[PDB]
């Protein structure tokens, strides 16, 4: 670099050091405050883990509610008969290898399809993970061989390929790391979620733009002056008709108020079991003289020149200590911000960052731990990392950055990043917009920590890179030491791994509707009928077991009546 470049880098670094100093001690006390807030709402309430099958489907099939895989599949007799024969073809190594490779060779087979097939296949094989794991390794070996002989960059492997195999590997980790979540990593993940959520609610949150006073995200940082006050509402408990205190802000929209009330009044109950804010009316008991109900929008909402403001608690002049109850029930809207970085905001981000730091450190540390709180490294991780090492060794590939990159690409950069961004895949919780925004910043820092690539700090650098510039180097060392420690461990024998996989398959054998998964998967058989059949006819091993004739029978059987 140039002397100028180095000069401006050093200035930016001390400029950062300066703003960090302004907030350092304040952050320490803010954290302690958050931690006692946290140990209250949860330390005496059970972490709301989803059950395995719900978690699995949330991850494997993102955003799909009531996936067929979790429910009955009433189907014609000939259809079920055909599907069961298809299911058995999936237990043929030669068939499944050929099936997947054929699909991927098709240009109409999209990235979306690749994920769909990867998820359906792993669900269908959930009861036979020992078999599945053998097939997965072959697929990965096939992918690695192909790419290294297409003569592509080693490090560039398992990154952009986005193969069915890589997606199946992610699903494989998803199945086999649930215990680790339950026992070790789930807690710090959940606590980070709670910390972020709680911290955001300490200040104004715009119900329309999703911006927040205390945003960890520069993009969602409220950039205007917002005066506000902390109110305490006393909510009539849905029991004695008994009451509880809830902290809210005067600027909070009525829905936000209702959601805050719900969170406290139902603090023990998992989210999906609570009533919805929109199915309740907030009623203000200044009575028994008067019981008046508040909403985001009613006859009193303020409208000015085509702008319509969401009603807040302050709109109704709700007073601190007010009694309250939750009872079953061409225009531009705005809430706090109406639209027709500087030091002050950089320091605000830094205060939030500093306040949440410990929760982030806890998560990253346990994700990259080999012997956490007495527990042991999950077998799936040692097994797969050893496999990757073997694949590297097969080619004399000694360069540490290669296997480091493969391991990062395969595990933390897919599985972990995904649950960090989406804790609601693991827990029965609601992740709101501002929380999602903060988690995105955390996920990016996490991603950066897994890279061997250098961190080039500059003004044009993303906020996360700037905020966490001093933390990344430490995190990177944790990751390096993680891979190192795992490699030193004793290899898991094939018999031991198989026994483990058999036990996992047994535990969850009936968690999913395999027939439903089979029917969904069969869609691709018919869309690429001709290509598949041709491949089965061409491949020598496929003929050995007359896979072509078997598929033909299935295709016919499903039509018959």
From Swiss-Prot:
Effect upon mutating residue 216 to G: Almost abolishes response to semaphorin
Effect annotated for changing residue 61 to A: Almost abolishes response to semaphorin
Source domain of life: Eukaryota
Tissue: Detected in embryonic hindbrain, spinal cord, dorsal root ganglion, trigeminal ganglion and superior cervical ganglion. In newborns, detected throughout all layers of the hippocampus.
Coiled-coil residue spans: 2-46
Disruption of the gene: reported phenotype: No visible phenotype, but causes subtle changes in the central nervous system. Mice exhibit altered apical dendrite spine morphology in pyramidal neurons. Mice exhibit defasciculation of the facial branchiomotor nerve and of the ophthalmic branch of the trigeminus, with variable severity. The number of neurons in the dorsal root ganglion is higher than normal, probably due to reduced neuronal apoptosis. In mice lacking both Plxna3 and Plxna4, migrating neurons do not show the normal response to Sema3A and Sema3F and do not migrate away from these semaphorins (in vitro).
Cytoplasmic-side positions: 2-561
Family the UniProt entry places it in: Belongs to the plexin family.
Name this polypeptide is given: Plexin-A3
Boundaries of the shown chain within the full protein: 1247 to 1871 of 1872
């Amino acid at each position: 670099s140039t002397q100028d470049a180095d000069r401006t880098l050093k200035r930016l670094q001390l400029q950062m050091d300066n703003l960090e100093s302004r907030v350092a001690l304040e952050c320490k006390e803010a954290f302690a405050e958050l931690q006692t807030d946290i140990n209250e709402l949860t330390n005496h309430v059970q972490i709301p883990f989803l059950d395995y099958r719900t978690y699995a489907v949330r991850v494997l099939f993102p955003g799909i509610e009531a996936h067929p895989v979790l429910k009955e599949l009433d189907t014609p007799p000939n259809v079920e008969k055909a599907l069961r024969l298809f299911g058995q073809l999936l237990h043929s190594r030669a068939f499944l290898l050929t099936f997947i490779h054929t699909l991927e060779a098709q240009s109409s087979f999209s990235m979306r399809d690749r994920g769909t097939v990867a998820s359906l296949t792993m669900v269908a094989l959930q009861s036979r993970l020992d078999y599945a794991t053998g097939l997965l390794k072959q697929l990965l070996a096939d992918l690695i061989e192909k790419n290294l002989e297409s003569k592509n960059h080693p490090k560039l492997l398992l990154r952009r390929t986005e193969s069915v195999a890589e997606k199946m590997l992610t699903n494989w980790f998803t199945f086999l790391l649930h215990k680790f979540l339950k026992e070790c990593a789930g807690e710090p993940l959940f606590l980070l979620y709670c910390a972020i959520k709680q911290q955001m609610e300490k200040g104004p949150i715009d119900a329309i733009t999703g911006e927040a006073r205390y945003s960890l995200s520069e993009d969602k940082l409220i950039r205007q002056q917002i005066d506000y006050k902390t109110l305490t509402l006393h909510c009539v408990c849905p029991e004695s008709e008994a009451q509880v205190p809830v902290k809210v802000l005067n600027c909070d929209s009525i829905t936000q108020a209702k959601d805050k009330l719900l969170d406290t009044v139902y603090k023990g109950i998992p989210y999906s079991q609570r009533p919805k804010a929109e199915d309740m009316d907030l009623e203000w008991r200044q009575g028994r003289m008067a019981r008046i109900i508040l909403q985001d929008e009613d006859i009193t909402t303020k409208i000015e020149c085509d702008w319509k403001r969401v009603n807040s608690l302050a709109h109704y002049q709700v007073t601190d200590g007010s009694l309250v109850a939750l009872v079953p029930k061409g225009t531009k809207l705005w809430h706090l911000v109406r639209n027709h970085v500087s030091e002050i905001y950089l320091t605000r981000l830094l205060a939030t960052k500093g306040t949440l730091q410990k929760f982030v450190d806890d998560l990253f540390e346990t994700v990259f731990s080999t012997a956490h709180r007495g527990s042991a490294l999950p077998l799936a991780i040692k097994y797969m990392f050893d496999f990757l090492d073997e694949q590297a060794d097969q080619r004399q590939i000694s360069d540490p950055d290669v296997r480091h990159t493969w391991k990062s690409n395969c595990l933390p950069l897919r599985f972990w990043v995904n649950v960090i961004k989406n804790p609601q895949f693991v827990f029965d919780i609601h992740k709101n917009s501002i929380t999602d925004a903060c988690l995105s910043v955390v996920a990016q820092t996490f991603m950066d920590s897994c890279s061997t690539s250098e961190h080039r700090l500059g003004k044009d650098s993303p906020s996360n890179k700037l905020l966490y510039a001093k933390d990344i180097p430490n995190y990177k060392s944790w990751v390096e030491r993680y891979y190192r420690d795992i490699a030193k461990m004793a290899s898991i024998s094939d018999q031991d791994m198989d026994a483990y996989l058999v036990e996992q398959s047994r535990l969850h054998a009936n968690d999913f509707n395999v027939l439903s998964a089979l029917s969904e998967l069969y869609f691709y058989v018919t869309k690429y009928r001709q290509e598949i059949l041709t491949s089965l006819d061409r491949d020598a091993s496929c003929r050995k077991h007359k896979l072509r004739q078997k598929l033909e029978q299935i295709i016919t059987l499903v039509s018959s009546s």
